[PDB]
Write a protein that binds this ligand. Structure first.
Ligand code: HEM
Ligand code: HEM
Ligand SMILES: *[C@@H]1O[C@H](CO)[C@@H](O[C@@H]2O[C@H](CO)[C@@H](O)[C@H](O)[C@H]2NC(C)=O)[C@H](O)[C@H]1NC(C)=O
Ligand SMILES: *[C@@H]1O[C@H](CO)[C@@H](O[C@@H]2O[C@H](CO)[C@@H](O)[C@H](O)[C@H]2NC(C)=O)[C@H](O)[C@H]1NC(C)=O
Ligand SMILES: CC(C)COc1c(Cl)cc2c(c1Cl)O[C@@H](C(F)(F)F)C(C(=O)O)=C2
Ligand SMILES: CC(C)COc1c(Cl)cc2c(c1Cl)O[C@@H](C(F)(F)F)C(C(=O)O)=C2
Ligand SMILES: CCCCCCCCO[C@@H]1O[C@H](CO)[C@@H](O)[C@H](O)[C@H]1O
Ligand SMILES: *[C@@H]1O[C@H](CO)[C@@H](O)[C@H](O)[C@H]1NC(C)=O
Ligand SMILES: *[C@@H]1O[C@H](CO)[C@@H](O)[C@H](O)[C@H]1NC(C)=O
Lengths: 552, 552
């Protein structure tokens, strides 16, 4: 009965009920006017005629390698291009943030309460006749049916971009500092109150936890030595809370910032590497600053490791995921003459789209061995047995799975894919197509257009009946990929805005933070500005093994 | 010890030790270079020649009323001037914030921990030889001596700008939503985690307190009716905690957003007015929106009151306080094509400069009664006896004290004035002249330049010896006022940047919030954009008594 249930306002206009069964669209600064904000203003008409499609842009960015080679070596051109991607991407995000799972209208509660994930689109009102608003049936199709018919792996589909397991575990490790759903509260709530790249997954969310992880000598984090190699310390040494099944022996209960990182040896690999990187940066800072005390060594190192992280995420991780020949750049100076909000609130939909469980192989391959899921999970003896070097060498060789294209979620994790479907519904997400318009994409007109084939498309039609009723999460995993690419259109177009805002929103990117003295001088500043996935592994893993995010 | 103890880096350069006995300045984006950032850039030399002093500017803005009359009646110019004041003042504030009482260098802890007040200048480090760095004696002069010789009132000195008790109590009430020192932790800590104009003093800091204060019908706040007049509910009725001495009867224990507001009838006056205003806007929104539930009516009203609050503070309060003939304007649209961070962190120094107790008279005059402090404190009987209409009429007629100029702190509050001095020192504040530099002011070269007279200057010179050792807080209350002004230069030049950033940094001012739909349509939007202290009183106080921030 809520008259805004049909989601009638278009082009980012805001709907508001003006009576028990009438509505009004606020078209302020949409660039359109009219009842539904669909009548464009002159300048908008021109802008929309000169805007190429995302797929048009993807082609140009993934072809003409010789030209981009030249462009990449003309700094002012490279800077101009990257400046434009940063600002044009980021305008797609609401900042300061607006809606959440409980608020489909702006409120001081939705603004102020940091425990919520925010919402790119408001939730469908409780009193709407259907789950998606007014379209479709009274109930969405059975999530188990959806799961089994179009999401579950039959045969492993390797990523055509050649993403490796160093990449898969990096994505998991990196994102789990800002994806930390509070299950005590509900799926639309977070325990990552920093809402960004604060490295709480290394240092801990709270000061108490951080202080138990710290050595209070030379700015360092506690560690232990086992077989001559540096690993994180134990729960017994540090007294910090971790999630471990009851049978894990005390000596293998490792303590790190993130409480769930001891449950996957690939996560524990990165926790070790970064802890190692933190202590290494303390030694460099102490060399430069014998006057400095423990506190400042610790704090400055943390700032540097945050910079290293954003640097690597942009120039290696996103570089690889995008497939672009254009050389992406981490340079905060790009935004200083530009309008940008140095803040971020993590979006629920960003959490949802980052569920890339199809990346996971059917087995994990370290040296001679091939480990099943049951063997791999909660099992840090494997890390100790093989060591980091072999972990890196092995995971650099092992191909990850393709994410879009359908039917490639491993069964070992099928409950996690079911919960993604079920919790999107619980949180009253709007439909795939509503989210496509939200990020200026053309709605799909059929399931065949979505999938780019006929079989999964036909199964989806039998379940959903109407393309307008298709759900975001399953669409992302079933969408037609770009040519020989890991993702489809929707993943990139919603993902790129959330991601870059979170990276460039950090306070260290603000002009008052982004200078040498923030990071202990030019030596500290250089560490950020020369950081790479290769150098991270080379400085902290014995024998400086080669590494990359793609299978070589 | 620390080589940065002498504050060597000028012009906002940042100082960093580079060894036990050496420093380096980071001159990044200061407009200067050289060892101490004192060598101006070509472009910088030009601006320093063309830039007039704040006093030259103050004269212009407070004279030529005929010329201002015309400017004020030309929308585009008025807007253009107000745009410039906003942007030019806001660039004085670090945003994202930087330092706090425990961190004199940037750290994630000082960024992320919302329980600190931030700092416009870092603290003087613990190992410095003197309180101010290196200058002065090993101890600052006895605070009691400073207080007695130059701060305490002999004879009430009236504000020549004619500020009244309506103004004085608006200031206390408004500011006490964001100045809420957490004495459990210490003077450098706040309970006002919203760090701005969130109206927690009406609605409560925590969800639990808000809920106790809410009626849960039609978006309203609980109230009671005494003698046909609306007042806040009691502690007993709502179980919300208030600070009252034990002898206060239960029927006078009023429960409002801010726990300390029962301490003064003047605060409770405004608490009643604003409670009435919230419930008034609920009625307005209920009329327009019969479809709406209690949550939305409550949330939407709060966003309108925050709007009303910012409107009145700029166009009534700051207008009066500035003494300007130019007509200031609350218009978020002014910043949309400018660079501006929609966030704020409340500074310790802003709290310190806002200790305007010289405003208080020796007795509070209502109707025909002259109440002493003892009689007035924690005495809501006074409010119920006289009523709101009489309070407004009385407080409108009673003049407040001048703040700068010296010797006007009421003796009844001397322990508060001594504390401001003692806490500044505990928080390791830099000197008056450092703060002047920080805010583009010329350092004072004698106590006579500071005071504009000889007697207090000489008292001050015997106590402090060096002008460079002089403290911020006492200086503000002894400073030579502008001609017939309530304040001296330093108060305005530090206070304006902090004030306007807090106002405009609110998210309701951001592009995506500032549209009709946020406030329930044009009718609610209109409530913000026509608000005034007069209309606040007229809509909510019986008989629509005339009011103003100045004596008639
Ligand atoms: C390596 C084996 C992995 C296992 C066993 C695993 C398993 C899980 C589990 C059990 C959950 C919690 C589900 C729930 O409580 O509803 C989860 C959530 C999640 N997974 Fe994975 N996952 C793996 C790898 C990955 C990878 C490579 C990614 C790629 C980024 C990823 C992304 C996510 C995200 C973003 C969440 C939401 C977490 C939160 O919000 O707290 N996972 N996964
Ligand atoms: C009406 C009579 C007033 C009394 C009895 C009074 C008394 C006090 C006291 C006792 C404190 C210390 C609070 C504490 O340490 O917990 C204080 C602080 C303060 N006063 Fe007043 N004051 C009055 C009026 C005003 C006025 C008119 C202003 C002008 C804005 C003002 C501004 C402040 C500020 C900004 C603080 C610091 C608050 C904090 O850090 O939480 N006061 N006052
Ligand atoms: C942020 O929002 C959540 C949801 O309203 C608040 O959590 C609830 O608080 C109430 C009352 O204090 C409890 O009865 C609920 O059980 C809480 N949880 C949930 C899931 O409803 C939370 O307190 C808010 N946080 C802040 C800091 O205001
Ligand atoms: C912000 O900083 C303060 C001060 O460091 C923290 O307050 C202290 O917390 C510890 C517990 O970890 C106590 O032992 C102290 O007594 C606390 N108070 C003070 C005044 O030191 C506070 O925990 C921090 N807040 C956050 C969110 O980290
Ligand atoms: C979570 C995933 C989707 C994010 O990883 C990506 C991917 Cl896969 C693509 C782009 C992107 C990011 Cl961040 O951001 C930008 C880029 F690469 F140019 F910076 C972009 C563009 O075309 O503007 C495309
Ligand atoms: C906390 C107190 C000090 C704030 O009250 C003031 C005062 Cl007293 C003066 C100005 C000011 C504010 Cl806010 O801000 C601006 C104004 F008036 F133009 F908006 C200003 C200017 O010259 O730019 C001067
Ligand atoms: C009483 C009108 C003249 C004011 C003179 C102020 C000089 C400071 O005198 C001080 O006054 C304080 C408050 O009364 C007392 O507590 C101190 O004992 C006294 O030294
Ligand atoms: C874990 O791996 C180690 C080393 O291979 C070994 O103790 C055991 O086979 C594994 N445990 C489980 C439960 O698979
Ligand atoms: C409070 O004010 C009343 C008038 O309402 C007055 O009669 C009374 O004596 C005052 N109380 C105290 C404790 O001074």
């Amino acid at each position: 009965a809520n008259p805004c249930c049909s989601n009638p306002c278009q082009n980012r206009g805001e709907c508001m009920s003006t009576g028990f069964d009438q509505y009004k669209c606020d078209c302020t600064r949409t660039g359109f006017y009219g009842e539904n904000c669909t009548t464009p203003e002159f300048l908008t008409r021109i802008k929309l005629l000169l805007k190429p499609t995302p797929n048009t842009v993807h082609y140009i960015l993934t072809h003409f390698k010789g030209v981009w080679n030249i462009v990449n070596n003309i700094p002012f051109l490279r800077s101009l291009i990257m400046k434009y991607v940063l600002t044009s991407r980021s305008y797609l995000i609401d900042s300061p943030p607006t809606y959440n799972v409980h608020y489909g209208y702006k409120s001081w509660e939705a603004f102020s309460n940091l425990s919520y994930y925010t919402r790119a689109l408001p939730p469908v009102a409780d009193d709407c006749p259907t789950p998606m608003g007014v379209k479709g049936n009274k109930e969405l199709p059975d999530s188990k049916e959806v799961l089994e018919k179009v999401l579950l792996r039959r045969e492993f589909i390797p990523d055509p971009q050649g993403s490796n397991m160093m990449f898969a575990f990096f994505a998991q490790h990196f994102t789990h500092q800002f994806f930390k759903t509070d299950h005590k509260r509900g799926p639309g709530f977070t325990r990552g109150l920093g809402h960004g790249v604060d490295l709480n997954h290394i240092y801990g969310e709270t000061l108490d936890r951080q202080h138990k992880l710290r050595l209070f000598k030379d700015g360092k984090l506690k560690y232990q030595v086992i077989g001559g190699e540096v690993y994180p310390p134990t729960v017994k040494d540090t007294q910090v809370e971790m999630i471990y099944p009851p049978h894990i022996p005390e000596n293998l209960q490792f303590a790190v910032g993130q409480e769930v990182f001891g449950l996957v040896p690939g996560l524990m690999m990165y926790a070790t590497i970064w802890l190692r990187e933190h202590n290494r940066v303390c030694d460099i800072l102490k060399q430069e600053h014998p006057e400095w005390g423990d506190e400042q060594l610790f704090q400055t190192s943390r700032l540097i490791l945050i910079g290293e992280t954003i640097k690597i995420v942009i120039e290696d991780y996103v570089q690889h995921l995008s497939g672009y020949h254009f050389k992406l750049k981490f340079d905060p100076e790009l935004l200083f003459n530009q309008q940008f909000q140095y803040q971020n609130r993590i979006a629920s939909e960003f959490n949802t789209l980052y569920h890339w469980h199809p990346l996971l192989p059917d087995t994990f391959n370290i040296e001679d061995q091939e480990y099943s899921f049951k063997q791999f999970l909660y099992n840090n003896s494997i890390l100790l047995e093989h060591g980091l070097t072999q972990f890196v060498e092995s995971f650099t060789r092992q191909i990850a799975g393709r994410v879009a294209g359908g039917r490639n979620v491993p069964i070992a994790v099928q409950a996690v894919a079911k919960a993604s479907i079920d919790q999107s519904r619980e949180m009253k997400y709007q439909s795939l197509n509503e989210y496509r318009k939200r990020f200026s994409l053309k709605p799909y007109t059929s399931f065949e257009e979505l999938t780019g084939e006929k079989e999964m498309a036909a199964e989806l039609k039998a379940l959903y009946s109407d393309i307008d009723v298709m759900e975001l999460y399953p669409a992302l995993l079933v969408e037609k990929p770009r040519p020989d690419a890991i993702f489809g259109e929707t993943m990139v177009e919603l993902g790129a805005p959330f991601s870059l805002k979170g990276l460039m929103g950090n306070p260290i990117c603000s002009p008052q933070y982004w200078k040498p003295s923030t990071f202990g001088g030019e030596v500290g500043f250089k560490i950020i500005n020369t950081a790479s996935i290769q150098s991270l592994i080379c400085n902290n893993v014995k024998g400086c093994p080669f590494t990359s995010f793609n299978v070589q």
